[PDB]
Structure formats: structure tokens, C-alpha cells
Amino acid sequence: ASGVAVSKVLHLEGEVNKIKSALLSTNKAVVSLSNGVSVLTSKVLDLKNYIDKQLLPIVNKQSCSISNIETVIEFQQKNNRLLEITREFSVNAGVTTPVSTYMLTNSELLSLINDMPITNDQKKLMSNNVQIVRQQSYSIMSIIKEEVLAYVVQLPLYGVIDTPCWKLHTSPLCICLTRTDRGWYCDNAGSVSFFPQAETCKVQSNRVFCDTMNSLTLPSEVNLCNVDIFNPKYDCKIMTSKTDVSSSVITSLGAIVSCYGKTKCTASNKNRGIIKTFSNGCDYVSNKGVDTVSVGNTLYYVNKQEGKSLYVKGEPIINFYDPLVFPSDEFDASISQVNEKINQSLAFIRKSDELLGLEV
Amino acid sequence: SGVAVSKVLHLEGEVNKIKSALLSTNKAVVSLSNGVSVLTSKVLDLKNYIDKQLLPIVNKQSCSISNIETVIEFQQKNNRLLEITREFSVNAGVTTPVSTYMLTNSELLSLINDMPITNDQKKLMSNNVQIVRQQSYSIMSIIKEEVLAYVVQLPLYGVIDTPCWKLHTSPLCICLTRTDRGWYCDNAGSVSFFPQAETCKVQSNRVFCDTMNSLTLPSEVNLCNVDIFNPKYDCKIMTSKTDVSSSVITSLGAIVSCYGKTKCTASNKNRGIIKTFSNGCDYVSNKGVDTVSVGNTLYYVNKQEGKSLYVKGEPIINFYDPLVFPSDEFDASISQVNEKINQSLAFIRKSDELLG
Amino acid sequence: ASGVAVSKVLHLEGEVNKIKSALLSTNKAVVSLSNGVSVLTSKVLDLKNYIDKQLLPIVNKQSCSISNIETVIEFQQKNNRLLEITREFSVNAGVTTPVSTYMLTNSELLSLINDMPITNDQKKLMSNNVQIVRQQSYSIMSIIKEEVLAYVVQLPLYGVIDTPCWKLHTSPLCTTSNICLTRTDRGWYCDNAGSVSFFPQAETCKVQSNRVFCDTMNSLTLPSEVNLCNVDIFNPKYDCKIMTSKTDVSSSVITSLGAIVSCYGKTKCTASNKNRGIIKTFSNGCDYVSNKGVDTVSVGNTLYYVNKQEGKSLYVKGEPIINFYDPLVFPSDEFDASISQVNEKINQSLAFIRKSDELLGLEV
Amino acid sequence: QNITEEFYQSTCSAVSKGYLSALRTGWYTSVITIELSNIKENKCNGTDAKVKLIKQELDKYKNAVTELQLLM
Amino acid sequence: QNITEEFYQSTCSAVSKGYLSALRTGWYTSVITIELSNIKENKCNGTDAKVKLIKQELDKYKNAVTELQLLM
Amino acid sequence: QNITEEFYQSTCSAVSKGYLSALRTGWYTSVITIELSNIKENKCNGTDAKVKLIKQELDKYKNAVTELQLLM
């Protein structure tokens, strides 16, 4: 139909120009996308450069400080003991007593004891009273260098053991007399050893530990001084007075009272108050039944007074460590979606090339 | 022939060009696909760095800091328990004086206002907490991992507010020297006498003694201060058949006993030698004399004031420089990238619209 | 109306329709890519928001804790000494002895010594025995505020020096019913200005080498005649301080260079030696034994040690502590190479479009 | 100044008058007790695997307490 | 060896000759002073909000100083 | 109870019988030695460049050891 055929060719002269425009828009479309991606790309690069130049170095300085710190803290833990010993020698100018448990631990003390040149009876005794042994010991710094410290421990050796001791107390008697040989007495080889300074004897339970260094040796006759002062077999060490006098001496299992003159004394009890009044003379009172004794206006305590309990509570300390976790899986899913979209974008192009037809 | 083949054929010379046009446009799109594939892998590897390499290190560090903090806080919240175990460790379980770790001031006062004594005694101790701490013991009693227990043992005073006095003695010239030096305090109608210096503490006009190792005497011993052969109490004396000379330094001065061919002299830090002693017993006051010199040995009647020392300290500073990110600018560039994609889809929608 | 021409026209539909489809696929191709990049973009945005909102703040809290910690640790290091001094005053209720090396360092002690009002002979002596001087000193807290601590150090001044001293030991002595004597004036003796000073408490004298350091405070002054008491007790020139006993008695006193033995009555004594055992038996009387040849002495059943007994060495080993710091490094260079490749691909993608526009044409 | 000093030439000696006494004649005993603020150790991998500070601190402490337990 | 020892049988006693004296007869007093290297606390949010180490350290110290202030 | 107490009115005095002795008459000396677990300082840039903790800790220690070396 001659005239429809011209209508066709018009559709088309006219088609080619439209498909020209079509393609111009498609190109601008592709240029827009190029730019997005150029920008996006630079923003990824800057992101990495943040991590590498800004973040990473800070995370290393911190790894280093933490290492420094830990090391220091571990210095003080792994030298806890060397460090305590130098504090001790520092405070006391190089000679301490008693021998601390930093200076000499229990398994070491026992070690040394089972090596001392003494009988098993002595070795056994010391093994039970490690406390007293430590207090009669010295610790004498001997060689000190940066990487090693050295010091002599000096423990006591007992020349005799398991002998009857006894502690003597005295009060006035009424002219007046007072025995001036108070203190500890222990039997030594056929004689009595007498220790007159309280500082030299330690006592733990029924057990006594004295230092013979400043002791006096006496004949066994001194014990007759306990019943008769003018005992003709040993002249008693006494102190006189031409005037009335009165006081109280507090012993270990009670207390002596010497009440002479116009002075008034009385033993009381924490439940019944005053339970005895002393007349002129020498009485003795047991710490079982009496709790205080009162000479004139001064008050003696025959027993330790039990007091108020104190209690300091503590709370558990807690450590809050909240870890940082990343959404790895979801992420990979989105990147897996992005590779999927590129795969099919190349499909659509391969399809298009095929109509031109480039095959690839 | 009814159509103009010349329009048809011309309309081809164009068609081949637009074919080429589109082949280049495809290659253009294939190039971009590849960029994005590479870029995509580099984002993935970036995340995997953060998740596998960086994140775990940031957690190990959160953990070490927790460990450390805890340890440091252990030593702060047990400051006191830890001092007490050091004390008992050093002294083998019995200390004196009673430290302030062992017993704090509000606790010491707590215990004092609970002691079975008068308000006059409670008040006295409250003012001299120092002396009271030095006459106390601290005896470890029960020790387990989670709790420590120990008896504090404070002193109780049976009498208070009594006249005390401290006696000094020097030689006198045959020669005599009184051998009853030491403190003296009035006890119920008698004098208590404390002969070891170690047993008495003194703070101001106040004295604190321990009756434990004391001798009880009649009030007649005080006549020994004026007359030695006092017929009412035989004085404890020590003789010598030969000339002798020395000096005793007291609290408010100093005694001098200068006998024989010995030369003594009291001096003063401003005028030097201000007195020469002849044979006999003189006494010198610490107000006017500063040193006394028996023979060649030199006694100091007063503490010599010395050189001040001073150790300066500097404030320690802590440099914490925080790490901040350019959030806003960034979002602006990503906002730009979404804008470009929006209009890239516009240009395609436009193009599809011309195709049907 | 028709002919070949009608063919050619259907042919031009022929190619033109194919190139229409070609372009439809190319558009869908571009829409696919747009979406990829939209997703990728959001995933980069979320990546940054992780670093900014989640990671960054934790890295700052940590910078802060490390600062806090360091400061605290540095507090205890830069106040090591102030902090030891408060511990000392705290433990002893404000008065310590001896004067620690926290309280007073060596260069300071020497500083003070060369400033004391004494002769160079005394200044020199103290300089050598800093140990003894520290043990005869006190340290008395005086003013204590939060930012500053103050305390008096109290060192001893020696009124005389370089005088003959000697230490006297005594044991019992006995007629052979018998009587006994024991001299009760044991202790140190030092010459003071024409008289002897006598120190009877062991606590008051320190001794270092041939050097003695006593405190005149609780001392007795005696005439030089007391020294005749060492040879004759009933010396008519000074009545000796003695203690009697009407009964036999026997013991041992251990001195510095040996040991005295007093063996009377039915008691048996013997000096032994760590190599030959018992090397002497004492008869009734007073003997003396040197610490060079004798190692123990044995009165009755009690055993005296004339010399310190050397014992077992102990040794506590230590190991070097190590610090493992393994730094975190990033593959910067390779990365840049991939990003450099991605910019290269975009460059040539624009080339291919510019080429295409040129055939349409748009000159660029 | 309450404290003064008389010197007796007759008996070579000085006395220091004017002090006020306080004679100890008894003991007061109170039992003080103290709890430990314990540390609950949170277990996790730290920076250095050989460094167990929390533990090494408790060990150190449990040890000091053991040495003392053995003095009795 | 300057130190020797004579033994007198006549008077059961040993003497140890050859020491050199130094008798204390006075006191020298010097006033030492020591400043604190204080810590200026930088305020910011840390790892654990309940842990204020800088403060707890000063508190600890201010306390030790208070207890001593009360001995006078 | 092994420990008892007799009181003699005749001689104002109390005796406490029933103890068992242990008289020191000698010394036993043992030489203990102790090594330092030293710290090998790993050198690197930390958080604050002015803070050299490892060093300041050794310095502190080397000092304590110097003061003691000077007592001999």
C-alpha cells in the first residue's frame, strides 16, 4: 500500500532520532554513576587512612602502656619478698628483731631448726614455739647488690631445757621489809639462774624462754628466803624502811595486798562489789574470785577487763568488662548481595553485546 | 517504487554509527562493574581487618585494664587490712605501739568512753592519744583468708593527778652519790619509785608510769633530798674513797660536781665562758648556760638548733588526648553519593521512556 | 506500491528493533549496578558509624583509664619517700628510732654532720659509722598537712671521743661449808675527764669494731681506783660492789673473746672443740677459755656456746620477667594499589563514554 | 609553766617538781575484726597470656595469711 | 686486732681492753620538710564508671594525713 | 593447768611454780640470699611520652639499694 509504506519509514526516520536521544541519556546516566563511585572510592580510602594513621597508632601506644604497667605491677608481685626485706632494713638501719616472715618463712625456719646441733627434744620445742623463736632472733643485713641481697639470720641456741622455773613477786611487810629479788628463777646445773630484767624473759603457756647473758647464779638456798627472811644459810637481799607503808602487787594468778597504817584497802568483784576488807597485815587474793583491789584511792586490776567488740565490714569489689562485638555475618550478606548485582549487571551487557553481536 | 529508498539507506549510515556508540557504552559499563568489584572486595577486607585483627586487640586491652584496675582497687579498699598484716608479719604477731592502721582515732576514743574509769581519766586519755598508743599492745588472735582478728590491749590507770617529780644526782666530796635517781609519784599514802627510764613516758607536765616494776617507799625518802643521814629513812648511797668529778644534765638545767685538780666551766653561745667552778657542787640553769665543760669532755645543757632541710615536689600531670572522628563531613560525601545514584536512575528512566 | 523497497523498509525495522532491545538490556545492566552501589554505599556508611559510635568511644575510655592508672602509679613513685615516712609515723604513733633512710638519706645525714658544732675528728668519726648514728637518733613528727610534711630529726652529739673503754665480765669465786663471791659491777667502762664512767644497762651502749658509743644519761661516775677491783677485791682504796653466798655455786659467763668457767662442788664441767670433742676438764677453781681453741663449754648438763655456730646457707632464685608487646600493623601500600586500580577503571569508563558521545556526537 | 626545779646543795642532787601522774595498774582488751574486700576474678583472654595479675595478687595475699597462720 | 682480753684469776672476772669511746652528752635537732607531688585529676568518662582510682588514691592519702594530724 | 601459785605470808611474797625453761646460751647463724626478678625494659613509644614507668620503678629500687650499700 504505497502510502502506508511511507508512514512506516516516517515512524522510523523518526525512530532512529529517538533512540539517539535514548542513548545520550543512558550515557549521562553512566557518567553520574562514575562520579558517585569516584567520591565513594575516595571516602573509602580516607576511611582506611583514618584507621592507619589516626587509630592504629593510638591502639599501639596503648598496647605499650599496658605492657609497661603490667611489668611494673608484676615487678612488685614477683619481688614482694625482696621488696619487704629492703623496707625492713631501711627502717631499722640494717638490723631487725624479731625475724619477720618476709625475712624467714616457716618452711625455712623449720628447715634451719632440723639442722641445728641440738637434741630432738630441743628441735621439737622450737618447732612448736616459732613465735617466741622469731622474737629472740636477729636479722643482720650482710651483702647488698642491685640483683641480689644477702643477710645473716641469727637464731638462738638453748643450752638447757625442761627445767623448773618460777616467778617471784614481793610486797611490803610490817619497821618494814620488802624483798628486792623479784623476777624469774630457773634451775641451772645444780644452781639457780636468776633473771632480773623483765625484758630478757619471754613466756608462752607453761613455757619460759630466758637469756642467760645477764643472769645471776645463785645456790639452791635462796629458796629458803621464801619462807624465812633471816634464813642463816643465805643472806636475803632485802630493803628496809622505818615507817609504815602499803601497796599492791598484781601477780599472774592473782594479787598481793599489803595494808598497814591508817590506809583502807578492799578487794571487789564485778558482781557483788566489795567482798573483803583487809586488816593490818599481808593478804593474798586469787584472780578467780576477785576482780579489782583498792589500796587507798588507787585502783588495781587483778584481771584484764573485757571490752567492746569492734567490726569493720568489707564488700566484694566487682570488675565490669563489656566486650565489643561486630555484626560480621549480616555484613557479609550485604556484600554478597553487592557481588550478585554486579554479576547480573555483566549478564545484561553480555546479552546486549550478543544482539550487536559481539559474543563474550 | 512508492517509498524513497534514499531515506531508508541514509537512515542506515546513521544506524551503524549508533551501533558503535552503544558498543563503547557497554565497555564503559563493564569497566565500571570491575572498579566496583575491586572496591567492594577492598571494603570487605577493611571490615575483616576491623573484626579479625583490630577488634580482638581492643578487647584484650579492655580485659587487661579491668585486671589492673581490680588489682589497684584491691590495694586501696584493703589499704588497712594490708598494713596490719605487714605489721604482724614484721614483728611476728605482737606490735607496740598500737598503730593508726591497727586502731583509728575515732575507734580509740570509742573504746576509751567505754572503759570502766571516771570521766577525769577518760578525758585525760582523750588528750594524750599518742602516749596511750605507745603503752598499748596489739596481739594478733585469729587470721583466716577473708577475715582478720586481733586483740588490742590498752592500759588502765588506777590513780591520776598526783604529784610526781624526777630526781637527779651527782657526786659530792671521800665522796658520795645518791643511787636512787628516777621518777617518783605519790601513791596511796606512800611514794611509788620507778627506777628504769624505759617505764615512764612524759608529755608536757604529764607523766605516765607502769606500776609493774616499781618500789613502794614511805614519804620520808623526801628528807633524803636535804639530809643524807636523815635518821628517819636510811638513804640508798654509794661511797668512794677518792676524789671524783662529773656533770648530770637535768630537764631544766644541769648539775656540776667539780672536785680535785679538774677544771670545769659553764659557757654560753653568745659570750663563751661565763663561769668557772671551784671545788664543790654547783647547779646551772638552761636559761643562761648552753654548754658545760668538765675537764676535756663537753656536756650540752640544751639541744643545739641545726640546719633546716627542705625537699621540694612538683605537681604531676596527666596527658590524655582523645580521638575524634569527622562524622559530619563524611555523611555529606555519602549524601552526595546517594544523590548521584538518584539522578543516575532518573537518566535511565528518561531513556526507557523513549523506548516503549 | 511495493517491490524490494518494501523489503528494505522491513529490513530497517530489522536492525533497528534489535538495537532497541540491545539498549534495553544495557539500561537494566546500569540499573543493576546502581543498586549494587546503593547497597555498597550504605555498607560503607554503616562501617564508619561503627567506628565513630561503637569503636571510637571505647578507645577513648581506655585512653582515659590508662591515664588514670599511670597517674596513680606515678603518684606512688614520685612520692615514694613521703609515703614511707607517713607509714613509719603511722606505725609508731609519731616517734621512730632508728632514723630510717626514708627519713634521712645519706647525703643529708652527712650534710647535717659537717654542720654540727663539733671538731673534725668527731665529724669524721660519725661519717664512718652512719649505722650506729642512725640507731641512736630519733625522728619526731612535728607538722603534718595535706601538701607538706615536717618532722624534727634528733641526732646525738658526743661530748668526748677516743678514750679507752673496756667491758667487764664476772663469774663466781669460791673458798674450797664454803663461801662464794661474785662481782656485781659488770658492764662497760669508759674514761671520762679524770674519772671512769660506768654504763650498767647493756641497752645504752652500741659497739662497732673497736669502737664504742655510749649514752652518758644513765651512767655512774667512779674514781680510777675501781680498776684495782680487777686484781684485788678487798682493795683498801675503793670498796668493791660484791654479792656473797654461803654455799657452793657454779656457772659460765660467755665473753667477747672467749668464756669464763666457775666449777666448784660436785659439778662437772668441760670445754670441747668441734674437731676433737672434749679437750679439757676443769677442777675446783676459776679457769678461762679462749674462743680460738674452744667451741663449747659444758657446766653440768647445760651447754654454753663460746662461738656462733655456722649454719646452712639458703638461696632463693629469681627469674627475669618478660613483657610481650606485639604491635598491630596495616597493609597500607597494597591497599592503595587496589584503590589506584579502581580509579584507573573509572578513568577509562569515562573514556569509553566520551568515545561514544563523539559518535552521536557530543564533543568533550 | 607548771614545771620547776629545786637544787639541794646539801645533797648533790636536783629535783624536778610539778608533774601529774597516771599509773597503769590494769589492762583493757577489745577484740577488733576486719573483713577482706575480696576480688572476684573475671576470666577472659588479656593482652599477655602469661600475665595473670588478679591471681598473682591473691596468691601473694593468701601466702602472707598462711605465714601468719603458722605463728600460732 | 686492737681488741684483747686479760683474765684475772684473783677476782673471777675477765676484762676486754682496747676500745675507743664516744659518749653522747647532747642533741642536735634539724627540721626536715617534704612537699607532696600532688595529682591534678583530669575529669572524663573512663572504662568503668564506678572506678574513680585517682580519687580513691587521694582519699586514702588525705586519710593517712588526718590520722596523724590527730596525734597532736 | 600446770601453773599454780603459793603465797608465803611469812615473807610478803607470792611464787608462781610450774614453768619449764629454755635458756639461750648460743647463737646459730645462717646466710640467706635472694635474687631479683629483674625487668627487661621494652623500648617503644607509649601513651604519654613523659611517663617512663619501668625506668622510674628501677630507679626507685636502685636507690633503696644504694642507701643500704652506704650503711656498711
XYZ file of C-alpha atoms in Angstrom, chain B:
356
model
C 8.561 2.175 -6.341
C 6.441 4.129 -3.843
C 8.914 4.762 -0.998
C 12.148 6.747 -1.255
C 14.868 4.188 -0.659
C 17.219 7.158 -0.199
C 15.648 7.955 3.179
C 15.850 4.293 4.163
C 19.548 3.866 3.177
C 20.692 7.175 4.661
C 18.814 6.145 7.777
C 21.353 3.315 7.925
C 24.788 5.163 7.613
C 23.483 6.504 10.925
C 22.401 3.134 12.325
C 25.956 1.696 12.069
C 27.359 4.682 14.000
C 24.788 4.345 16.778
C 25.679 0.615 16.904
C 29.330 1.596 17.629
C 28.164 4.209 20.051
C 26.438 1.541 22.080
C 29.393 -0.874 21.970
C 31.539 1.764 23.633
C 28.829 2.477 26.151
C 28.771 -1.230 27.104
C 32.523 -1.459 27.556
C 32.132 1.704 29.633
C 29.657 -0.164 31.862
C 31.928 -3.238 32.050
C 34.849 -1.073 33.214
C 32.736 0.413 35.992
C 31.493 -3.097 37.033
C 35.115 -4.059 37.607
C 36.056 -0.986 39.570
C 33.090 -1.684 41.874
C 34.037 -5.366 42.175
C 37.529 -4.388 43.318
C 36.245 -1.577 45.531
C 33.760 -4.000 47.041
C 36.454 -6.521 47.902
C 38.524 -3.691 49.476
C 35.586 -2.708 51.691
C 35.109 -6.371 52.691
C 38.804 -6.687 53.558
C 38.547 -3.477 55.507
C 35.764 -4.874 57.664
C 37.636 -8.152 58.105
C 40.588 -6.147 59.364
C 38.431 -4.451 61.986
C 36.730 -7.730 63.001
C 39.611 -10.208 62.959
C 42.682 -8.034 63.599
C 41.684 -4.837 65.429
C 38.589 -5.732 67.435
C 40.188 -8.670 69.272
C 43.178 -6.491 70.311
C 40.781 -3.846 71.617
C 39.116 -6.473 73.784
C 42.296 -7.980 75.211
C 43.078 -4.427 76.262
C 39.689 -3.875 77.841
C 40.429 -7.049 79.810
C 43.936 -6.108 80.950
C 42.699 -2.719 82.071
C 39.943 -4.456 84.059
C 42.505 -6.821 85.644
C 44.798 -3.919 86.510
C 42.071 -1.672 87.914
C 40.809 -4.526 90.081
C 44.309 -5.206 91.474
C 44.899 -1.475 92.196
C 41.469 -1.310 93.849
C 42.290 -4.353 95.914
C 45.194 -2.440 97.470
C 43.102 0.690 98.049
C 39.986 -0.946 99.511
C 42.141 -3.126 101.749
C 44.758 -0.467 102.449
C 44.203 -1.052 106.133
C 43.915 -4.856 106.275
C 47.104 -4.978 104.194
C 49.053 -2.673 106.549
C 48.022 -4.712 109.544
C 49.308 -7.945 108.003
C 52.590 -6.227 107.181
C 52.870 -5.138 110.821
C 52.133 -8.547 112.300
C 54.489 -10.079 109.703
C 57.427 -7.831 110.601
C 57.027 -8.247 114.377
C 55.953 -11.884 114.473
C 52.433 -11.171 115.663
C 52.785 -8.695 118.542
C 53.316 -4.980 117.943
C 53.763 -1.893 120.121
C 52.830 0.907 119.865
C 49.290 0.477 118.567
C 49.482 1.942 115.078
C 46.782 4.053 113.435
C 46.230 1.192 110.980
C 45.589 -1.104 113.866
C 43.309 1.334 115.676
C 41.979 4.626 114.229
C 41.332 7.743 116.310
C 37.523 7.530 116.256
C 37.859 3.887 117.396
C 40.388 4.621 120.178
C 38.066 7.307 121.538
C 35.177 4.866 121.096
C 36.943 2.341 123.340
C 38.023 4.983 125.849
C 34.470 6.256 126.549
C 33.670 2.613 127.284
C 36.471 1.874 129.774
C 35.398 1.331 133.434
C 37.057 4.568 134.629
C 35.941 8.083 135.710
C 35.309 10.971 133.291
C 38.524 12.556 134.570
C 40.524 9.552 133.334
C 38.542 9.202 130.075
C 39.236 12.911 129.442
C 42.962 12.609 130.201
C 43.482 9.699 127.793
C 41.414 11.516 125.130
C 44.024 14.289 125.076
C 47.144 12.116 125.082
C 46.241 9.592 122.400
C 49.922 9.481 121.492
C 51.194 8.219 124.870
C 48.229 5.827 125.177
C 49.161 4.268 121.823
C 52.755 3.767 122.944
C 51.767 1.983 126.150
C 49.433 -0.355 124.272
C 49.955 -3.686 122.566
C 48.326 -5.259 119.566
C 48.135 -9.051 119.667
C 47.080 -10.996 116.577
C 44.437 -13.579 117.636
C 42.628 -15.179 114.628
C 43.659 -14.980 110.983
C 41.762 -16.500 108.032
C 41.806 -15.596 104.330
C 38.633 -13.496 104.385
C 38.806 -12.077 107.926
C 41.482 -10.935 110.392
C 41.054 -10.569 114.120
C 43.296 -9.226 116.824
C 43.088 -8.085 120.425
C 44.091 -4.521 121.199
C 45.337 -4.162 124.752
C 45.061 -0.630 126.207
C 46.295 0.456 129.652
C 44.028 1.294 132.591
C 45.199 3.906 135.141
C 44.486 3.087 138.772
C 45.267 6.598 140.006
C 45.648 10.043 138.428
C 46.520 13.712 139.111
C 49.145 13.002 141.751
C 52.363 14.964 142.362
C 55.321 13.412 140.538
C 58.925 14.518 140.457
C 62.149 13.338 138.834
C 65.296 13.112 140.909
C 68.818 13.596 139.561
C 72.060 13.128 141.450
C 75.782 13.861 141.082
C 78.864 13.277 143.256
C 79.643 15.173 146.452
C 83.026 15.396 148.246
C 85.703 10.723 150.455
C 82.737 11.005 148.022
C 79.025 10.226 147.961
C 76.479 9.847 145.223
C 72.798 9.168 145.710
C 71.836 5.985 143.801
C 68.040 6.462 143.760
C 67.754 8.530 140.570
C 64.482 8.295 138.657
C 60.811 9.195 138.841
C 58.703 9.465 141.979
C 54.889 9.654 142.076
C 52.611 9.806 145.122
C 50.612 6.620 145.648
C 48.035 5.994 148.381
C 49.987 7.467 151.338
C 53.298 6.173 150.070
C 55.673 7.170 147.273
C 55.981 4.940 144.186
C 59.511 4.883 142.724
C 60.207 3.928 139.105
C 63.911 3.162 138.549
C 64.024 2.220 134.830
C 63.758 5.153 132.453
C 62.047 2.895 129.930
C 58.883 2.501 132.053
C 57.832 6.185 132.278
C 56.624 8.359 129.391
C 56.352 12.137 129.828
C 54.283 14.638 127.783
C 54.201 18.271 128.964
C 53.590 18.449 132.745
C 52.076 14.999 132.468
C 53.728 11.665 133.411
C 52.627 8.110 132.615
C 54.263 5.261 134.527
C 53.843 1.490 134.812
C 53.451 0.294 138.428
C 54.606 -3.172 137.372
C 58.283 -2.736 138.206
C 58.056 -0.092 140.897
C 59.179 0.121 144.510
C 56.937 1.412 147.299
C 58.547 3.853 149.765
C 57.440 5.871 152.824
C 57.063 9.647 152.426
C 60.297 10.000 154.418
C 62.554 9.351 151.418
C 61.983 13.002 150.576
C 64.067 14.018 153.597
C 66.949 12.398 151.753
C 66.902 15.415 149.394
C 68.097 17.734 152.153
C 69.913 15.432 154.575
C 71.576 12.164 153.629
C 71.976 10.828 157.171
C 68.344 11.574 157.912
C 67.567 9.302 160.930
C 64.051 8.565 159.618
C 64.991 6.717 156.418
C 68.389 5.190 155.631
C 69.341 6.693 152.243
C 70.485 4.450 149.383
C 74.010 5.791 148.748
C 77.280 4.816 147.033
C 80.654 5.851 148.500
C 84.169 6.374 147.184
C 87.472 6.954 148.963
C 88.907 9.124 146.190
C 88.200 12.483 144.538
C 85.777 12.325 141.578
C 84.067 14.847 139.232
C 81.342 14.863 136.543
C 78.147 16.508 135.258
C 74.495 15.438 135.155
C 72.176 17.120 132.638
C 68.659 17.590 134.002
C 65.457 18.799 132.331
C 65.654 22.478 133.312
C 69.441 22.775 133.554
C 72.445 20.752 134.674
C 74.388 19.847 137.845
C 78.207 20.106 138.082
C 80.467 18.312 140.557
C 83.970 19.746 140.269
C 86.479 18.361 142.773
C 90.230 17.754 142.667
C 92.603 19.208 140.088
C 89.894 19.092 137.421
C 88.786 22.298 135.665
C 85.141 22.913 134.741
C 83.320 25.882 133.152
C 79.810 26.817 132.010
C 79.667 28.628 128.675
C 77.017 30.464 126.699
C 76.500 30.602 122.930
C 76.924 34.405 122.932
C 79.667 35.248 125.466
C 81.526 31.944 125.631
C 82.858 31.016 129.063
C 80.763 32.834 131.699
C 81.640 30.900 134.924
C 84.446 28.782 136.399
C 83.507 26.300 139.105
C 85.539 25.885 142.286
C 85.643 22.782 144.480
C 82.065 21.912 145.357
C 78.610 21.343 143.950
C 77.042 23.979 141.724
C 73.898 23.978 139.626
C 73.307 25.784 136.342
C 70.039 26.826 134.599
C 69.302 26.078 130.937
C 68.070 29.657 130.557
C 71.521 31.231 130.903
C 74.032 28.414 130.228
C 74.299 26.464 126.945
C 77.225 24.068 127.488
C 79.227 22.851 130.489
C 82.746 21.550 130.259
C 84.243 19.085 132.771
C 87.914 18.536 132.004
C 88.027 17.848 128.284
C 84.509 16.387 127.934
C 81.729 18.725 126.859
C 78.097 18.494 128.036
C 75.165 20.131 126.174
C 72.662 21.609 128.591
C 70.395 22.489 125.630
C 69.520 20.923 122.287
C 71.602 22.584 119.592
C 69.404 24.050 116.871
C 70.583 22.998 113.425
C 70.246 23.383 109.683
C 66.776 23.276 108.108
C 66.358 20.862 105.188
C 63.626 21.073 102.552
C 62.705 18.649 99.746
C 60.570 20.265 97.049
C 57.968 18.440 94.963
C 56.327 19.176 91.630
C 52.726 18.588 90.558
C 52.474 15.539 88.296
C 50.397 15.985 85.140
C 48.357 13.536 83.054
C 48.143 13.932 79.270
C 45.004 12.356 77.817
C 44.379 13.433 74.205
C 41.056 11.998 72.892
C 40.439 10.688 69.379
C 37.678 12.389 67.407
C 36.131 11.484 64.044
C 34.909 13.853 61.222
C 31.395 12.413 61.253
C 29.520 15.302 59.654
C 31.740 15.933 56.617
C 31.741 12.228 55.917
C 27.938 11.943 55.904
C 27.921 14.865 53.474
C 30.059 12.936 50.968
C 27.909 9.809 51.355
C 24.853 12.046 50.953
C 26.421 13.254 47.731
C 26.952 9.684 46.550
C 23.295 8.817 47.093
C 22.338 11.981 45.221
C 24.372 10.845 42.195
C 22.705 7.432 42.169
C 19.267 9.010 42.425
C 19.860 11.049 39.274
C 21.593 8.165 37.512
C 18.297 6.292 37.809
C 16.490 9.389 36.553
C 18.539 9.433 33.343
C 17.743 5.777 32.718
C 14.024 6.173 33.482
C 14.108 9.047 30.971
C 15.799 6.819 28.459
C 13.462 3.866 28.953
C 10.620 6.343 28.453
C 11.798 6.948 24.870
C 11.716 3.224 24.017
C 8.333 1.665 24.937
